[PDB]
Amino acid sequence: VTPIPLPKIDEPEEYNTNYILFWNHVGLELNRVTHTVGGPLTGPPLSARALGMLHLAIHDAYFSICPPTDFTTFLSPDTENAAYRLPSPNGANDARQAVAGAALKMLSSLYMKPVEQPNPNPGANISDNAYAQLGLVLDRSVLEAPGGVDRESASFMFGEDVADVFFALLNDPRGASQEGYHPTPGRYKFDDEPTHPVVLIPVDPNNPNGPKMPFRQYHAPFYGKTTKRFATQSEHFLADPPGLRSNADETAEYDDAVRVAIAMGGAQALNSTKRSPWQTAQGLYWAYDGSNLIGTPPRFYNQIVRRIAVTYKKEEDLANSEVNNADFARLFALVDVACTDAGIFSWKEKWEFEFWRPLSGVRDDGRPDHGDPFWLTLGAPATNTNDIPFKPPFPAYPSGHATFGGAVFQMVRRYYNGRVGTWKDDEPDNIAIDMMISEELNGVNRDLRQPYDPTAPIEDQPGIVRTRIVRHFDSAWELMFENAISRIFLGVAWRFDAAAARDILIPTTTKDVYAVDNNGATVFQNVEDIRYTTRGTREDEEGLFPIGGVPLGIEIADEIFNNGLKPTPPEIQP
């Protein structure tokens, strides 16, 4: 089959001389390729789960052979419960081959055709071409692996065993099932996107030019409540969103939220849009909304973490350093597990409340002086395609991006505290990075004038090229903040989907109403002053709970970290 020409990644090629980074890279390649061909594990929550599984297998394969001192493996060889019993090396002492076996096994089990019956129903929707393209990636990775891959080594085979255990334990074949789900229309209720109410999909994935059929997609409505958590030691909840349940009386907040939504997230040319060109850039920068050759958010977070990892490594040698190998193996397991669980809980809460997206909220508001029945958002960028901006096929509260970011960056903060600088775990850090480029704005990717051609490199395809923007950030606190507000700029998130409006916006004399500048644009607090303290109530539970994605993510990362990356007790699994 003709291999898809993938655009070059903006990252020093030296990174991939390290085998932990290399295998992470392979996972990221599969992420973007599966989103280009429509293969398995697409979408935000499941793509995160795949990386968590990959790094958990790598983590245990490496630390079994090269025992850690300050912590232990995720699973142990002395577990009485077979499902949680980690294989023993028994002579295997080649960590490089152990990691290779684990990585190759896990990725193969995850992305290759589920010949073992699972092909029916679950996988019965992915074309053979999709599997073919994914296989190419895996195949050449074996050939590109630093130091080579010796499939005959005992160490390699051991790694495979490790992967088998994690796969059988954590894989959720029916994770993205939507069978039986249907929206419950009403005020504040999620329903089909007015801009993309239905889509025509081919009856046969293997014949994309043959007959189509109307399809209404709902992204993983049961995943969050039914799936097996990775390392969380409890269930996490958020305050009821403004307008619902115990907070149904929070009308001033909601009304002002509608106001901020129109001004900050509308289409570029609308007269009501007050968002600045720089804010528009911040919005697209963090997108990674499952586009061709780009993938989902977890991919970008890992790209950023890769830079942080190399920028703050203890030893200069990327290739031959056990200090670096252990550091990277540990960091990525923590980060990707935090990301996986953040995906589980953001999705659990998303479908729990089924809060509508700003587009529907503004349009269907119903009040002549509040809504705009013809409003349009900047929307999720339809990169490397000729389709128009959409909005993620799932509820708004909390923001998936915000939760993912909260988890990933709080983990990075907990991990590097006292090493890169010193800070209170709930206050701004100094983990700066520069030369950070998003593939949404890299001077290569673009908005095509015609349908994407997978046999030609993106550069040879007519379209409007995305401006290349090279960024520098002063801290993971900033990354966390900007990743969250980018969704407000795209018009896909309400302000409270990110965090409590009181913690991120500039207040006025009127309660629940926030400051705007001379030209109407919403004013945000300085990153250094932001503290996620404001909590709210839940109708179904006593106590105060976090508001928005960022606080939820922070909470998840702290818990996992504080427990040293320990499996979720099976007793508390769904």
Ligand code: VO4
């Ligand atoms: O994925 V989002 O909920 O941030 O649109």
